């Protein structure tokens, strides 16, 4: 689902909606949450609604709407999770960030914000995030289950703001050679995190997932919200 009415509006004139969830009270630092490749779907509202309940406000901008809008797949679906497939080997990750920019943007200057702006994302959004991370577009930024994260390990200098990441030990998407590579060239800039969650794997914390694991989700999700509370 989106919110009706919303729209953001980026540099190169594309503009797309998002689905927001405004704060119980305010100001309240605003969190832009970056999607899987399923599109604002089930657990991004479940998401959205999960931080509006711990005292932030959320912005989840539809990414997928420069190849097609309003879309919100269902994993369990076969052909739903197909189309998804095809859509994440379309995706721009350039335009990505651009949009995620412009969602950033658009959450500093809410009526409800407080000048504070984190980033959550999962899967493909938490390759988003490392990307926002180096480019330095939001006050810290938190990744679930990144994708391709080893393949982006030049960038590690560049981030200067914090971040974590929650990363599921026998997650198949990331060989234990990437594990390497990855806690090899987070652990050396003293602002990046990576927690290894052993007993999990891919979207640990997505419930609808068979890949769920409670313990790991809940002190995943703990560790996220204590990364974040210095914003409010």
């Not at 594309?14 to 100001?27: C, R, Y």
């Not at 990750?93 to 994302?121: C, F, T």
């Amino acid at each position: 689902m989106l919110t009706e009415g919303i729209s953001i509006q980026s540099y190169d004139g594309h503009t797309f909606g998002a689905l927001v969830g405004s704060p119980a009270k305010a100001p309240a630092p605003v969190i832009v949450i970056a999607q899987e490749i399923f599109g604002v779907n089930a657990f991004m509202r479940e998401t959205v609604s999960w931080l509006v309940d711990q005292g932030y406000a959320a912005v989840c901008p539809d990414l997928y709407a420069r190849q097609a809008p309003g879309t919100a797949l269902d994993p369990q679906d076969e052909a739903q999770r197909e189309q998804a497939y095809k859509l994440w080997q379309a995706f721009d990750m350039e335009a990505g960030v651009g949009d995620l920019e412009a969602a950033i943007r658009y959450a500093r200057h809410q009526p409800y914000s407080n000048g504070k702006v984190g980033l959550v994302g999962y899967s493909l959004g938490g390759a988003l995030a490392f990307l926002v991370a180096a480019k330095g577009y939001v006050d810290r930024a938190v990744g679930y289950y990144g994708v391709g994260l080893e393949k982006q390990l030049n960038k590690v200098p560049e981030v200067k703001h914090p971040a974590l990441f929650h990363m599921g030990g026998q997650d198949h998407f990331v060989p234990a050679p990437s594990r390497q590579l990855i806690t090899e060239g987070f652990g050396a800039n003293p602002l990046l995190q990576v927690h290894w969650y052993e007993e999990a794997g891919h979207s640990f914390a997505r419930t609808s997932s068979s890949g769920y694991v409670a313990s790991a989700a809940a002190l995943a999700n703990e560790r996220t919200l204590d990364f974040l509370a210095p914003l409010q």
